[PDB]
Design an enzyme around this catalytic site. Structure first.
Site, mmCIF file in Angstrom:
data_model
loop_
_atom_site.group_PDB
_atom_site.id
_atom_site.type_symbol
_atom_site.label_atom_id
_atom_site.label_comp_id
_atom_site.label_asym_id
_atom_site.label_seq_id
_atom_site.Cartn_x
_atom_site.Cartn_y
_atom_site.Cartn_z
ATOM 1 N N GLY A 1 0.779 -1.224 0.000
ATOM 2 C CA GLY A 1 0.000 0.000 0.000
ATOM 3 C C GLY A 1 0.817 1.283 0.000
ATOM 4 N N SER B 1 5.580 -6.169 0.525
ATOM 5 C CA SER B 1 6.040 -4.772 0.518
ATOM 6 C C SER B 1 5.830 -4.079 1.848
ATOM 7 C CB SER B 1 5.338 -3.995 -0.588
ATOM 8 O OG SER B 1 5.466 -4.707 -1.801
ATOM 9 N N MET B 2 5.278 -2.871 1.842
ATOM 10 C CA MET B 2 5.069 -2.158 3.101
ATOM 11 C C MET B 2 4.414 -3.033 4.151
ATOM 12 S SD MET B 2 5.260 0.676 5.098
ATOM 13 C CE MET B 2 5.773 1.810 3.901
ATOM 14 N N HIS C 1 10.460 -5.506 -1.508
ATOM 15 C CA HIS C 1 10.840 -4.740 -2.685
ATOM 16 C C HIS C 1 10.934 -3.261 -2.397
ATOM 17 C CE1 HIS C 1 6.450 -3.785 -4.160
ATOM 18 N NE2 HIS C 1 6.894 -2.882 -3.300
ATOM 19 N N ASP D 1 11.121 -7.425 -6.768
ATOM 20 C CA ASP D 1 10.249 -8.216 -5.905
ATOM 21 C C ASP D 1 10.974 -9.476 -5.501
ATOM 22 O OD1 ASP D 1 8.267 -6.380 -6.405
ATOM 23 O OD2 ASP D 1 7.410 -7.614 -8.040
#
EC number: 3.4.21.92
Lengths: 179, 179, 179, 179, 179
Positions: free
Chosen positions: E54, E83-84, E108, E157
Site C-alpha cells: 500500500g 512490501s510495506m 521490494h 520483488d
C-alpha cells in the site's frame, strides 16, 4: 564387530541398491524398507544408489514401497544412477534426493522385446507403450519437468552430471562434504 | 583370536581395495568408509590399494565417499595401482598418499565403447569424452600437475615407479620401514 | 534378530512369493503358512507377490494351502503377478487382496507341452484341458466374472493395471499408502 | 440469539464460511476462531463450508489459524467446496471432516497471473509453482494420497461426489441424518 | 457481546491490519494502538498482518506509531505480508515478530510516479530516492542485514517463505501451534 557390514548399516537405517535391478535384489530392498518402517515408522531411511537400471516391474516394487511406507526415503546416488536407477533416485522424498560431485545420471526409455503371433505382439507392444508413458508421467511429477521435456530427453540415452541433475529437478542438491 | 581377519583390521580403521574395481566390491568399500566414519569421524581411515583398475563409475563412487566423509583417507599403494587404481591413490588426503617401495603405477585414459545407432554412438562418445575431461582436471588438481600436462601423459599408458610417483605428485612419499 | 531380514519379517507374519513359481520355493511358502497357522490360527497371514508366473501343480500346492489353513491370507501385489501369480493373488481371502499403485497383473491360459505316442498325447492333452478346466472356474469364483467371461479374457495374454485390477474383481483394492 | 443468527450460532461455536474467499471474509473467520479459542480451548469448533474458493493467501491465513489454535476444527461441507474450499474442508481435524449427501467437491491446481518484465515474470512464475508445491504436499497429508496422487488429480478440475470424497480421504464420513 | 468481533478482540489487545494499506485503514490502526497504550501502557499489543502492501506515507504513520508507543507491538503475519506489509511486520518489537507456517512474505523497493515539468519531476524523483534510502536503512536496522545487503535483495520483488523469513531477519520465529 562389523561381522556383517550392511546389516550393521541397517541400524543407522541405511540401505544399498547396487547393480542390476531384478526381482530378488529388489525384494531385499523392499523387505529392508518395511523392516525399517516397523522398527520405527518415524525416522528417515537412507537409500544409496549405484546401479545401471534393470527389469522395471522389479524396479517398481521398490518405488511403490518407497511411497507406501510411512518414513520418508532419502536417496543418494554414488557412481551412477541410470534408467531405472535414475527413476528410484528421483523418486526419493522431495528435498532429500542427492548426488555426490562426480556421480553421473542417465535417462532413456522402456526397453523390451516380445516374440510370437501378431495378435500377441500388439498386446505386449501396447503394454510397453503404456509403461513407457506412465514412467514418463511419474518422472514428470518427481522432476517438476513437463511431459514434453521428459518425452524428448528420454527418447534417447541422455546424460546429466551432478550439477545438471540438480538443475533438472532429478535430485535436489549436491552433497560435497559431510559438514 | 582372529576369526574374520578383515573385520578385525576394519577395527584398526583399515579397509582393503584389492583387484578389479566394479560395482559390488566398490560398494563394500564405501560401506566400510561410512561405518568407520560413523564410529569415529575424526581419526584417519587407511585404504590399501592393489588393483589393476576397473569400472570408472564404480571408482568414482569410492572417490566421492573418500572426499565426502570428514575423516581423512590415507591411501597406500602395494603391488600396483593402475588406471582407476592410481586415480583413487592420488585422491587420498593431500599429505597422506603413499607407495610401498616396489608398488607400481600406471596411468591412462578411460577405456570403453558403444554399439548401436550412429546417433546413439555420438551421445555415448561425447559422454566418455566429457568424463575424460573431468577425470583429467581432477588428476591435475590432486597431483599439482597442470591439466594440459596430465593430458599429454594420459593419451597412452604411462608407468610410474614409487619414486617418480612421488615426483609426479601422485603420492606424497615412499613408505619403506615402519618407524 | 536381523540376521535374516526375511526371517525377521516372518515374525510380523509376512511371507514373500517372489520370482518364478516352482516346486521348492512354493513348498517353502507352504511351510511358512503352516508355521503361522500353528503360532496363531487366528491372526492374519500376509503374502506378498511379485511373480512372473510358474508351474501349476506347485502353484496349487500353495493355493490349496491358503484355503486349508484357518488364518486368513491377505495377498498384496508389488511389481507384478502374472499367470499363476495372478491366480494366487486373487486367491487371497476376500476383501484382503491388494495391488500397490504401479503394480501390474496379467492373466492368460495354462501353457504346456508333451511328447510321445498319440495315445498318451491325448491322455495329457485331455488332462491339460481339465486343468484349464478347473483353473478357469476357480478364477471366476474368486474374481466374480462368469466362467465364460474369465474364459474369454484368458484365451490370450491380458494385462490390467492396478485400477483395472480391482474392477475385474481380481483384487479387492489398491493398497495406497501406510496411513 | 436470533437478532443476528450468525452471532447466535457463534455462541454454539459454529462458524460459516460462505462464498468467494478473500482477505476480509477470511479475517472474520480467523477472528471467530481466535475468539472461540479464547472462550474455551477444549471444545470443538464447527466450520461449515459452502465455497467455490478464492484467493489462496486469504485461505492460508485460515488454514494456519485453523491448525494453530488448540481446539479441534470440524468441517461440514454443504452445497459445494471447490478449490480453496476443498483444501480448507480437508484441513479440518482428522475424523471430524464430513460431507452432506449431495455436497459436491472439486479440486484443481492454483491459478495466477503476472504482468511485467521477463525477469520479474521469472520470480512470479516460480513462486506460483513453489505455492502449487506446498499446497499439493498439504493435500497429501490431510488425504493420505501420495504427493503424486494429488499433483496428478489436481492437474485439472476434478469432481468428487460425497462418497468419493470419503473414499478419497477428503472428508471422513457423510452425515445424512441427525440422531 | 460478539456484536462486533474485532471489538471483542480489540479488548484482547489484538489489532488486525488487513489488505491494502492506506490513510484511512492506517489511521484506524494507529488510533487502535494509542487506545491500547492508554488502557494499559505495559502489556504487549498484538498486530496481525495479511496485506499486499500500500501507500508509503500511510505506512509510516503506522510505523512511527508502533515505535512511539510504550507497549511492545508484537507482529504476526497470516496469509501474506508483502512490501510495506512486510516492512511493518519486521518493524515489530524485537523477538516479537512471527509468521504462521504457510504465510508468505515479499519485499521490494518503493514504487511511485509523478507528472509535470522537468523541474518538478526532478524534485519529486529526488524525493522518492530519499525515501528508498530511508526505507532501506530502517530495514537493515530491524532485520539485522546490512544496507548494502538490503538494496541488493530489494531492487526486485523478492519472496520469502515463513522459514526463509526467519532465516533472513524479518521475523524472529514461526508460530505453528498453540502450546
Amino acid at each position: 564387530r562389523s561381522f556383517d557390514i550392511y546389516s550393521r548399516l541397517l541400524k543407522e537405517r541405511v540401505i544399498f541398491l547396487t547393480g542390476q535391478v531384478e526381482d530378488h535384489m529388489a525384494n531385499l530392498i523392499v523387505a529392508q524398507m518395511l523392516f525399517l518402517e516397523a522398527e520405527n515408522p518415524e525416522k528417515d531411511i537412507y537409500l544409496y544408489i549405484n546401479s545401471p537400471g534393470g527389469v522395471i516391474t522389479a524396479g517398481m516394487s521398490i518405488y511403490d514401497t518407497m511411497q507406501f511406507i510411512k518414513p520418508d526415503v532419502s536417496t543418494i546416488c554414488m557412481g551412477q544412477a541410470a534408467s531405472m536407477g535414475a527413476f528410484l533416485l528421483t523418486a526419493g522424498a522431495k528435498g532429500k534426493r542427492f548426488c555426490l560431485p562426480n556421480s553421473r545420471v542417465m535417462i532413456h526409455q522402456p526397453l523390451g522385446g516380445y516374440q510370437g503371433q501378431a495378435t500377441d505382439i500388439e498386446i505386449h507392444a501396447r503394454e510397453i507403450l503404456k509403461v513407457k508413458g506412465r514412467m514418463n508421467e511419474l518422472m514428470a511429477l518427481h522432476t517438476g519437468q513437463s511431459l514434453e521435456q521428459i518425452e524428448r530427453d528420454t527418447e534417447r540415452d541422455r546424460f546429466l552430471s551432478a550439477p545438471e541433475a540438480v538443475e533438472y529437478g532429478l535430485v535436489d542438491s549436491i552433497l560435497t562434504h559431510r559438514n
